[PDB]
Amino acid sequence: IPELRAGLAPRDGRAVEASFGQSGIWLIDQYLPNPAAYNGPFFVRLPFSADPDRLHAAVRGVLRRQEVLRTTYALSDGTLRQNVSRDDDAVVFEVARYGDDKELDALVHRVANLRLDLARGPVIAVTCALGPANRSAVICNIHHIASDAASAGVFLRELLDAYDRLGRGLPVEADPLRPTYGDFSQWYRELMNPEALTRSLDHFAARLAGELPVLDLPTDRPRPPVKQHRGGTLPLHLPAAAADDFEALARTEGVTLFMALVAAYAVFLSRHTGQRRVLIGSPVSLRDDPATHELIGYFVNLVVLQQEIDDRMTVRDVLRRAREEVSEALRHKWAPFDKVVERLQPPRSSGYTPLVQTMLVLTQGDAGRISHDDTELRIERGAAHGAKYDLSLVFERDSEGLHGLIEYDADLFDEPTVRAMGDRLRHLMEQFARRPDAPLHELEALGA
Ligand SMILES: [K+]
Ligand SMILES: [K+]
Ligand code: NA
Ligand code: NA
Ligand code: NA
Ligand code: NA
Ligand code: NA
Ligand code: NA
Ligand code: NA
């Protein structure tokens, strides 16, 4: 994997082709809601009362430092291009007030429900929310084509740095030595040369050959002819003790926390659906190179994980099988998801996604929190989304430990059905940590 370098893309004004990820997203763009919440609009509670004029000036400084925020998109001769403008004020901005969490969440909903224009911009919105004494919040929506979950922490770190510099009368300008998203886009095209691309597409095409299962969860409603894009969320409420034993389980069995979550979720899906084979999508970060860690952009590729489950496997068996599947997938993680779909030529339907109908995410680092000025600031996500998937399981591990959230499609589910699912999943995860040797058929269902 070659290092990413600044200037790989022409610095002479010519528009770089959109990245593989961006191309996939632009082709989907209707005026639909954000497809998921975990990578969508976000806010941060600040322990001071931000000055609005200086905060707006700080935002302009972030636009100057983050070229993807100044990028719009257009087809030119059959190629989707990244057109970069010099307008550092291309942001949907407002100053508003809140006196309690309800009023703050109302401001969050207004930002979160914006439908930003990829051809004309802006591709970012920021609200400076002024709260009760010494409290304020920054609310932000960066279009999916221009961001990923980690971009939220990158944005806030850059914003707060700029706010502080401006306060001190210091300049806030682009770092010419940092690579751009345009540089990354060209680097990725060079990495996916014809041989390398064919090799990774060949891998998934073999792994995922034949008649793939379509997730068959019990639902409260049949899938409707007209999808309404109405996403819900519900906390998993995984006890802190079990969450800690689950992390210990992963460590002692020699798998990553993500591998163990994949395994537990696959057993949950297999039980609920009745299906032996289950497919789980996961958005894998492409920020391997430290040169990408301070950039806003779409540095993710969706991979498909296939698991087979039966009730004579042990907890340990399914952890080890998750380890093998995840290990092999991550080796081939640069093969763009939409090209995998194209190779597999799935039978696609309106409403249900290609290849995968559910996802599992583990939120880490800049997607969940930052430190600024020796203060830990949590990145909080809005709850509105378009329910691209039937269900998404979004996990995060903080100091109190690991916690989870279920993003779900309200076209299919009433909330008490999702609460029941979440109860069964957390129960399974607690059993995993207690009985790693047990055959799955000995892990009794909740309420037996
Ligand atoms: K519709
Ligand atoms: K980062
Ligand atoms: Na916060
Ligand atoms: Na707002
Ligand atoms: Na609720
Ligand atoms: Na079923
Ligand atoms: Na990322
Ligand atoms: Na078997
Ligand atoms: Na893609």
Numbering used by the authors: 80 to 527
Can you list sentences taken from the study reporting this PDB entry?
The C domain binds two substrate-loaded PCPppant domains—termed the donor and acceptor PCPs—and transfers the growing peptide chain from the donor PCP of the upstream module onto the aminoacyl subunit carried by the acceptor PCP of the same module.
The crystallization construct comprised residues 1 to 533; however, the first 79 residues did not yield resolvable electron density, resulting in crystal structures of only the BC domain (91 to 533) and the preceding 11 amino acids. (A) Crystallographic structure of BN-BC at 1.7-Å resolution (N-form). The two cross-over elements—the floor loop and latch loop—are shown in red and beige, respectively. Also highlighted in red is the junction between the N- and C-lobes. In both crystal forms, the catalytic tunnel of BC is wide enough to accommodate the ppant arm and their substrates at both the donor and acceptor sites. The tunnel is ~38 Å long with a minimum width of ~1.4 Å at the bottleneck, as measured by CAVER 3.0 (29).
